[PDB]
């Protein structure tokens, strides 16, 4: 037993198709336009928006 | 009839039958009041329990058994034991993957008090939970409902 917490979470998701020209171009455009270090920053913001959309969708299935 | 069938004397432990009574003051038999109790939960004491002569220490009504816990029901399946019957409880168990049910059953050995005379195979019995009465018996028959086809 320790007084430590192991609640940790990955903040991004790797794309299913590694070498897809359209997605590579879109991500590089975002990186260059916003001065991002790598593709993981794009994937992190994408993951944030994806979780928000999932929550909104699950709320939209409930009664008004 | 012949209550004393065992090697030891059979009597209700709470009834004193050796009180001194003069001969000329006899009306019927000298003295043998019958011990019985009303179990709770709205169950009616069978008339055979009140006016019977059987000695059963595991009887819910005239014995030393307190009914507490679960009240269950079953159909009488076998009656080949002394003061004990085997009932069958049928139920449906839900398997979630297939969203369906399966028939399962459990056999339960319950004590049958001799107050329920004329109990057949296939009629419903309401049993109540008591302390362990033997290795496998933990329920006492409290009510007997006859089968639908029984005339």
């Amino acid at each position: 037993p320790v007084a430590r917490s192991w609640v940790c979470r990955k903040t991004y998701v790797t794309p299913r198709r590694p070498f897809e020209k359209s997605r590579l171009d879109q991500e590089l455009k975002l990186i260059g336009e916003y001065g991002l270090r790598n593709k993981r920053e794009v994937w992190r913001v994408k993951f944030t928006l994806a979780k928000i959309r999932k929550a909104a969708r699950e709320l939209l299935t409930l009664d008004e | 009839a012949d209550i004393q069938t065992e090697r030891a004397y059979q009597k209700q432990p709470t009834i004193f039958q050796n009180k001194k009574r003069v001969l000329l003051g006899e009306t019927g038999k000298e003295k043998l009041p019958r011990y019985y109790k009303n179990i709770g939960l709205g169950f009616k004491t069978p008339k055979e329990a009140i006016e019977g002569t059987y000695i059963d220490k595991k009887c819910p009504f005239t014995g030393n058994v307190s009914i507490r816990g679960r009240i269950l029901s079953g159909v009488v399946t076998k009656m080949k034991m002394q003061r004990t019957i085997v009932i069958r409880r049928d139920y449906l168990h839900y398997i979630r993957k297939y969203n369906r049910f399966e028939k399962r059953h459990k056999n339960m050995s319950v004590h049958l008090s001799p107050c329920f005379r004329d109990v057949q195979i296939g009629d419903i019995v309401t049993v109540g939970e008591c302390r362990p009465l033997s290795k496998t018996v933990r329920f006492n028959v409290l009510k007997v409902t006859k089968a639908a086809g029984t005339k």
Partner: protein
């Protein structure tokens, strides 16, 4: 395990203690006493986590061993002493009295009471029995035994105990129309008038309760603690009067309070 357990893991502690997760591995295991382990607030949690009078368990011990803390009128030096519902905590050095009273969230509020109110406490009678050559005895939720109670007092009633002498001075019957708090379950900490008691022989009676705002809930009979005759409590209630606001009304009240400042 062999014999009794002596430790309590911090994460297995009752959630209403509002202990965090990174302070330590252990929570203060309440000592045996008047109240159950999960229905009590140890003295250390009260004097350190709620009142902030101490920063550590060592300082809680330092306070307790100066005999400054009274629980139900008696000085207690056990820092894990189980203080529970209705218990009166008196700190005469700082001149403050508290009564351990549930919040609408199910937590023991820091509820300060007047020194006149600190003279008595309500107790729900757990059982009535005759013993010792016809002497009637009464046992409360506080686990105190009282000989020669009033013949009208029955189980589930509420008595008023004068802490100085510890004898019954008044009692409320368990009747429909009497104010009551809930001391367990989902509705823990809610205050309302008893509407009806549905009886289930051989099982748990259910008591229905209606809030002062008209909200109706239900609990088991073992979770009902009669507080006052009619709708008037015999004790002081916390800032929330036992009315459990929904999360929407809590949000609205918080937003209104925040927007009123600045």
């Amino acid at each position: 395990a062999r014999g009794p357990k002596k430790h309590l893991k911090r994460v297995a502690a009752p959630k209403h203690w509002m202990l965090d997760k990174l302070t330590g591995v252990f929570a203060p295991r309440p000592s045996t006493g008047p109240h159950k382990l999960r229905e009590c607030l140890p003295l250390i949690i009260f004097l350190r986590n709620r009142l902030k009078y101490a920063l550590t368990g060592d300082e809680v011990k330092k306070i307790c061993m100066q005999r400054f803390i009274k629980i139900d009128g008696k000085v207690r030096t056990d820092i894990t002493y189980p203080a529970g519902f209705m218990d009166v905590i008196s700190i005469d050095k700082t001149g403050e009295n508290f009564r351990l009273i549930y919040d609408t969230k199910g937590r023991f509020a820091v509820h300060r009471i007047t020194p006149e109110e600190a003279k008595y406490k309500l107790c729900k009678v757990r059982k009535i029995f005759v013993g010792t050559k016809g002497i009637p005895h009464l046992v409360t939720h506080d686990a105190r035994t009282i000989r020669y109670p009033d013949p009208l007092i029955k189980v589930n009633d509420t008595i008023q105990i004068d802490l100085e002498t510890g004898k019954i001075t008044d009692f409320i019957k368990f009747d429909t129309g009497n104010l009551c708090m809930v001391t367990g379950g989902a509705n823990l900490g809610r205050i309302g008038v008893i509407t009806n008691r549905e009886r289930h022989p051989g099982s748990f009676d259910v008591v229905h309760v209606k809030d002062a705002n008209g909200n109706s809930f239900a609990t088991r009979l073992s979770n009902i603690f009669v507080i006052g005759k009619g709708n008037k409590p015999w004790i002081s209630l916390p800032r929330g009067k036992g009315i459990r606001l929904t999360i929407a009304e809590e949000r609205d009240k918080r937003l209104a309070a925040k927007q009123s400042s600045g």
